[PDB]
Design a protein around this ligand. Sequence first.
Ligand SMILES: *C(=O)CCCCCCCCCCCCC
Lengths: 40, 215
Amino acid sequence: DSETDLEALFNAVMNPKTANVPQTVPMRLRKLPDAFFKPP
Amino acid sequence: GRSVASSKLWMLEFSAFLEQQQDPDTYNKHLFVHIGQSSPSYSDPYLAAVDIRQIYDKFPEKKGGLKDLFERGPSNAFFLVKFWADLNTNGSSFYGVSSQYESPENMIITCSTKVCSFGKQVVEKVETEYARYENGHYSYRIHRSPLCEYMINFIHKLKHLPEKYMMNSVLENFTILQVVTNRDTQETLLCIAYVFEVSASEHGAQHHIFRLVKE
Ligand SMILES: *C(=O)CCCCCCCCCCCCC
């Protein structure tokens, strides 16, 4: 595999059943300011 | 609007755009993201802090990576920009990026831009810029730098996604690291970490700028 595979990146969201990418913590779950998620 | 400045360098302008030529005398420009466009650029320490440890995973590690750069300092050169990108657009196309900087010092600067996926470097674009004297300061301009093919491909793939939550899902693992350096001294003049979402609002592209701190 390759983490930088562009096709795999988009396949992960288009076809979740065949997703083959690193598993990550969503930004909204992190210790970040409210302004990070609410546009001005 | 709000911009980005250390003790030695201020980024007044930053924009990524698609320019379409209808005919030899007619051009349409779409801005994906912009800093210092809609209103005159300014800089002050009136912006919030982000714990840099919360974002190390999204950027290159090891020597020369974000942690290494941050630890070497200076601390006041490090920023996080959150963009809400405007994707509502689209032989005669030009994808470009433009930026402008000001410094009290006459330097030769290098601007490195690294595009990353899952915190791993995909591509790097490196540009060398010389100073021009302007109204009691030195100005540096990267004018209409062509967007790399990876980025053009990425934008095309984003727009072919049927749902916006899918675009945001992809974007959570897409980042850009910009490091502006004094070529000779290797001092970090500006280091800007870019994070992205898709804009939904009617006015278009938006941004928020944060200081990166150690905590
Ligand atoms: C060289 O190619 C790197 C130039 C820096 C890229 C500018 C940012 C591109 C933003 C386009 C919007 C698509 C991401 C949501």
